[PDB]
């Protein structure tokens, strides 16, 4: 009656049956579209304009009020309207092919209203509005187009079966979770931020004048979701002042207000009240002693009105009357102070209570009673997914659209023109803004590009199925990528189960870019009202009636960072809340953290909290199953039975949700993990349980197995248990076999290199015209596989091959991380691949005249024709599929008319009227035209895409890698006869050097080879899942059972001499990957060619025939060598040699005519004394740039002593 | 003149000079060119 690992994997299988790997993106977007858009519309629902009566002296002057109310929003399915005006439903593949944004139009119900003031003599603002005119029904008005995330509930592919996906040219394996903007796929990278409504106390480092700072980043639940931030700074002890003063930094205040003054502005004038707010214990004298100096500092202000005046004088406005200053101070104190607590009248008591709480926390850290906060604790951070981000963007864009509508109202009213609702809205605002933000990633308005966030949207990575899965689950921390702050980059303890420990890029973004674990769930947010209602009805004492003195031992209750009140029995409250969540009466995303030392009960329901699921251990006092998992074997058998059953209703099967709603699985975030005790496996629970039942928990232990620490006797109750430790890994770390037998940076290196492995990325790559694609001819699934691969679908779309690898020193061509590849194996298709590239062109147009034509250009009329071949183009200016092209051969023929007024030296004969703008093939590439797609673009102009294919056979210089960070290039290829063989005639496909193994300590590579050999011999698949009881001893026994040396060695013979090698070789199958780094993609040589126009130096880039940079370090190396002429050649004769004539009198470049051999300096009237200077063109450019700043850099060739 | 294939039908469409790219049994606005008439030779190594 103990849970097994097979049962754990059945539970995980159910999880992934009901959960997609793109679930976070999809659910966030669904939340944004279904709910957040309506809330954003409502928050700015009404627009009102009051036309007062100007005193023009004409009888008939009456004030008017015009009102526009924005109603419900309607989102249709994505559609396209053509040039001819026909409107059709649009499908993702057509959008990808024709470069169309896959967006759905949005309509909003607007209603208009006009009212007349009852009397015009009333003071402004007191006019009574009588209903004059009103729209009987609303007008459904198109306001914009929202890009639709693929596979979301509003996509055309939602609820669509596999067969219909094929009919649409869609891969059933594709998970969606992205957008199509102008044909390109864009994924929104989750953005990490610090949580709002949390008080964080930070110790400022010396010699900063501030000792400690308590900061809260207050955000309204839905009212723009984050505006105000406050600080409470304690100032450092000074030799002049015997005490430290507490000053509150508030929005829109130029100075730090002493805390007592802001308390008085809140009505807590008496000192006793203030120190009861701050120091809840009268008997504690250190707190009051530290508060005394600020009371001393703030005695000059003893009343609320004087405190408000003090605040107002320090507002951003100077030279204002006292009444306005007091009004402004009260307005700031009400609205811009702690808006998450409240923003409405009569709530100064709660804000004062929370301010006292913040001061108490900061002084607890200043007394060194509690440690400061950890800025990097994962439970204090939130992930903004597509939902929240698109919500902020749409709020901004809808505000801009409403401003436009209001300006339209004002302009129409001024001119007495009739107001039309349809003409009022500039629908281009929302459409263009969303399109621009999703396309460029620059997050915000086009006009605030520098201040906007960047890189929020990235082109989806279609190199391998696993790389795409990884890209859909990527988080970015917007820390400075140049500043060297190792702490944010480090792997925190709280990352356990939330972020992948291994998968993180190497380089500047190491540790900042993170990847969600397999079972990590990111909350989308839920209402806090039901939870507050349950708290109120269960005995929550409101904060208005709370008196700390009466109940100092009672526990503060927070919800979303709002101190709602105080409870007297927080244990029972917490058990009741947890029970409710365990029935889903409360949302499963709700964090219920009881902090016993701090006497707090924090509830969280907001979005962005990363959670992970865990088993629940039965802890009920009267239960007969103390210390045993709630989930029985019966529940597992139910999962197996309902997995296959399809006759059952799809929504009424027993699966993952049935476990959560039944109280057998619980989602915990990092905040709640701090209050739980988690067993690492059911066997650990059991061992602890016998240890606690008096049994010795002792037995004969397989010496080959991992050694675990003995069960801790100090642990008597476990609250949870992990479903499987292997779930702490990401997409790519879950493809590594035996990752727990490797040195961790090798796991990171494999996680990075698995993205670049060649395979089949989508099944529909044939019908997709991608810019770049690399496809493996004969992909094979690994012989050694992890159980997590079933959910990553690596067996379905693998990205490598099982090569027979021998670890041997054979001819010395595999040294320094090179490999030797069998040439016969290459000839038979090993690691062969296809490279597809796509060239896009289209017809342009300006005004009413088309200035481009897809045609076969003719030498006799087209000016400036390229040097490539125009003979492979067909009559329609294009190139047919199946033809062979190379280098600069033209694949698309396009011409542009020239203005009739242009006269280019007569080179443009009377026949020459056009100019060639054709598209040549890349100079460094050649192949066969695979495909030529022809269509029309959004503007009804012709639009062509030419896909070329080119087979790449492995050769010397091509990167290959194992799944263990073992990367190399091919150094040499030997044929079948020349390679070492076994007594069966097995010849390895690859030979790798032994020296790669010891230093790197990639023992997982050797264990993989042995296990793959066993599985190839026996046919059973090899389980390489981490943290299993699969030992090398068991694999050795299995291998010996097949008539092989147990450790994987084989007697091999020399191919050259047939002699039996003195050493026995480690030979067996290992999964290798062809990497996107091919030598021919990189080989580059330049003799001469293009130069930059400005500097006249070799251009940059292999693709554009550019030179290589001779940098500062190379110059230093040649200096230390002493090779003066080498430097002169590299930096002058080979880059930008140039000649000028300087005047020997003034030292400035002269006017030189070499044709006439006449030189002149008008300034000096010099025509005889000149010098010839050889210098870099960049030097002459620098000198001219200086002369443009009135600096005269003068070159004198003779010592002017 | 030039014949293209309806990306849905695969039906042969004889588009002419400056005509909307559309399929006449399938309205599809995406079509493909046809395999060239040139000789295609590949060595089997």
């Amino acid at each position: 009656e103990t849970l097994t690992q097979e049962d754990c994997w059945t539970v995980i299988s159910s999880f992934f049956e009901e959960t997609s790997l793109a679930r976070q993106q999809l659910f966030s977007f669904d939340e944004f579209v279904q709910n957040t858009m309506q809330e954003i519309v409502d928050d700015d629902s009404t627009l009102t304009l009051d036309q007062y009566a100007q005193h023009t002296g004409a009888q008939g002057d009456v004030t008017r009020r015009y009102e526009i109310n924005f109603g419900q929003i309607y989102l249709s399915r994505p559609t396209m309207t053509e040039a001819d005006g026909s409107t059709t439903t649009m499908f993702p593949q057509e959008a990808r092919l024709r470069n169309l944004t896959y967006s759905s139009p949005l309509y909003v119900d607007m209603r208009k209203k006009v009212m007349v003031a009852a009397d015009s003599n009333v003071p402004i603002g007191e006019e009574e509005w009588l209903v004059e005119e009103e729209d009987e029904e609303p007008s459904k008005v198109f306001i914009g187009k929202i890009p639709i995330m693929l596979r979301s509930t509003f996509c055309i592919l939602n609820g669509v079966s596999d067969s219909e996906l094929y009919d649409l040219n869609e891969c059933p394996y594709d998970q969606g979770g992205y957008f199509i903007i102008n044909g390109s796929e864009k994924v929104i990278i989750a953005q990490e931020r610090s949580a709002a409504n949390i008080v964080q106390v930070f110790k400022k480092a010396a010699p900063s004048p501030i000792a400690y700072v308590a900061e809260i980043r207050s955000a309204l639940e839905r009212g723009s979701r984050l505006i105000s931030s406050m600080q409470i700074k304690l100032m450092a002890r000074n030799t002049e002042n015997s005490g430290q003063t507490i000053r509150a930094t508030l929005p829109y205040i130029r100075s730090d207000i002493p805390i007592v003054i802001v308390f008085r502005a809140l009505g807590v004038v008496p000192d006793r009240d203030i120190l009861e707010h701050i120091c809840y214990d009268p008997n504690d004298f250190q707190m009051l002693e530290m508060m005394k100096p600020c009371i001393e500092e703030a005695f000059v202000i003893q009343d609320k009105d004087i405190a408000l005046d003090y605040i107002g004088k320090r507002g951003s406005t100077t030279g204002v009357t006292r009444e306005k200053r007091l009004r402004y101070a009260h307005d700031i104190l009400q609205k811009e102070l702690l808006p998450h607590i409240t923003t409405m009248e009569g709530f100064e008591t709660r804000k004062a209570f929370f301010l006292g709480y913040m001061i108490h926390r900061m002084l607890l850290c200043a007394l060194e009673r509690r440690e400061p906060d950890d800025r990097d604790h994962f439970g204090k951070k939130r992930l903004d997914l597509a939902g929240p981000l698109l919500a902020s963007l749409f709020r901004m864009l809808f505000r801009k659209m409403t401003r436009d509508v209001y300006k339209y109202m004002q302009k129409c009213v001024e001119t007495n023109r009739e107001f039309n609702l349809t003409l009022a809205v500039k629908s281009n605002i929302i459409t263009n803004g969303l399109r621009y933000s999703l396309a460029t990633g620059n997050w915000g308005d086009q006009k605030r590009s520098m201040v906007n966030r960047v890189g929020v949207s990235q082109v989806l990575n279609r190199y391998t199925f696993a790389s795409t899965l990884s890209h859909l689950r990527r988080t970015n921390t917007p820390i400075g990528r140049d500043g060297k702050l190792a702490k944010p980059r480090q792997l925190h303890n709280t990352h356990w189960g939330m972020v992948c420990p291994a998968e993180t890029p190497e380089g500047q973004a190491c540790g900042l870019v993170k990847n969600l674990s397999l079972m990590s769930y990111v909350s989308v947010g839920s209402p806090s009202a039901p939870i507050i209602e349950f708290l109120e009805e269960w005995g929550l004492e409101t904060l208005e009636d709370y008196n700390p003195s009466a109940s100092p031992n009672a526990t503060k209750v927070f919800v979303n960072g709002v101190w709602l009140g105080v409870h007297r029995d927080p244990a029972h409250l917490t058990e009741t809340l947890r029970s409710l969540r365990r029935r889903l009466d409360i949302s499963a995303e709700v964090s219920i953290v009881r902090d016993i030392r701090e006497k707090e009960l924090r509830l969280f329901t907001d979005a962005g909290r990363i959670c992970r699921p865990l088993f629940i251990v039965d802890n009920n006092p009267n239960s007969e199953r103390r210390g045993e998992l709630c989930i029985r074997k019966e529940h597992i058998q139910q999962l197996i039975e309902d997995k296959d059953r399809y006759d059952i209703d799809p929504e009424q099967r027993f699966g993952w949700t049935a476990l959560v709603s039944s109280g057998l699985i619980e989602y915990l975030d990092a905040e709640e993990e701090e209050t739980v005790m988690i067993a690492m496996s059911p066997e650990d629970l059991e061992a602890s349980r016998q240890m606690q039942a008096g049994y010795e928990v002792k037995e004969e232990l397989d010496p080959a197995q991992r050694v675990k620490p003995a069960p801790n006797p100090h642990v008597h109750a476990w609250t949870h248990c992990e479903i499987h430790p292997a779930m702490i890994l990401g997409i790519l770390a879950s493809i590594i076999p035996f990752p727990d037998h490797n040195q961790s940076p090798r796991n990171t290196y494999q996680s990075a290199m698995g993205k670049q492995a060649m395979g089949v990325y989508l099944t529909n790559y044939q019908v997709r015209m991608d810019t770049m694609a690399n496809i493996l001819y004969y992909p094979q699934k690994p012989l050694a596989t992890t159980r997590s691969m079933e959910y990553l679908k690596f067996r379905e779309l693998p990205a490598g091959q099982n090569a027979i690898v021998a670890i041997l020193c054979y001819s010395g061509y595999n040294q320094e991380d090179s490999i030797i590849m069998n040439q016969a194996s290459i000839d038979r298709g090993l690691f062969r691949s296809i490279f597809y590239r796509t060239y896009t062109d289209q017809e342009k147009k300006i005004g009413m005249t088309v200035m481009e034509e897809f045609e076969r250009p003719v030498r006799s009329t087209t000016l400036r024709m390229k040097h490539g071949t125009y003979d492979k183009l067909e009559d329609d200016g294009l190139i047919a599929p199946g033809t062979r092209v190379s280098g600069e051969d033209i694949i698309i023929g396009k011409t542009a008319p020239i203005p009739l007024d242009h006269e280019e030296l007569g080179q443009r004969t009377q026949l020459h009227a056009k100019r060639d703008v054709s598209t040549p093939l890349r100079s460094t590439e050649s192949g066969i035209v695979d495909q030529v797609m022809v269509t029309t673009n959004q503007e009804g102009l012709k639009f062509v895409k030419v896909r070329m294919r080119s087979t790449r056979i492995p050769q010397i210089g091509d990167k290959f890698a194992s799944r263990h960070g073992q990367k190399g290039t091919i150094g040499m290829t030997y044929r079948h006869e020349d390679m070492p063989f076994s007594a069966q005639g097995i010849v390895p496909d690859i030979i790798i050097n032994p020296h790669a193994i010891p230093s790197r300590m990639t023992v997982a590579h050797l264990v993989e080879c042995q296990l793959s050999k066993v599985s190839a011999l026996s046919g059973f698949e090899g389980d390489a899942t981490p943290f299993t009881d699969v030992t090398v001893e068991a694999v050795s026994k299995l291998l010996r059972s097949h008539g092989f040396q147990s450790r994987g060695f084989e007697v091999m013979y020399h191919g050259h001499t047939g002699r039996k090698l003195v050493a026995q070789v480690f030979l067996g199958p290992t999964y290798y990957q062809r990497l996107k780094h091919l030598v021919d993609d990189k080989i580059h040589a330049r003799a001469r060619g293009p130069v930059q126009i400005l500097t006249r130096q070799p251009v940059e880039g292999r693709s554009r025939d550019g030179g290589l940079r001779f940098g500062e370090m190379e110059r230093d190396c040649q200096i230390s060598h002493g090779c003066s002429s080498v430097l002169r050649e590299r930096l002058f004769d080979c880059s930008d040699a140039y000649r000028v004539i300087v005047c020997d009198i003034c030292g400035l470049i002269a006017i030189a005519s070499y044709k006439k051999d006449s030189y002149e300096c008008r300034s000096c009237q010099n025509r005889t004394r000149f010098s010839q200077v050889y210098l870099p063109y960049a030097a002459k450019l620098l000198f001219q740039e200086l002369m443009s700043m009135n600096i005269a850099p003068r070159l004198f060739t003779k010592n002017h002593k | 003149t030039m014949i293209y294939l309806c990306a849905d039908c695969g039906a042969r469409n004889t588009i002419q000079a400056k005509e909307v790219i559309r399929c006449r049994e399938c309205g599809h606005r995406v079509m493909y060119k046809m395999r060239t008439k040139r000789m295609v030779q590949f060595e089997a190594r």
Partner: peptide, 16 residues
């Protein structure tokens, strides 16, 4: 929604 999506996909030729 699934049924509507199926209807829209299958008749894309007729609805065009």
């Amino acid at each position: 929604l699934g049924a509507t999506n199926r209807e829209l996909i299958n008749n894309r030729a007729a609805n065009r």
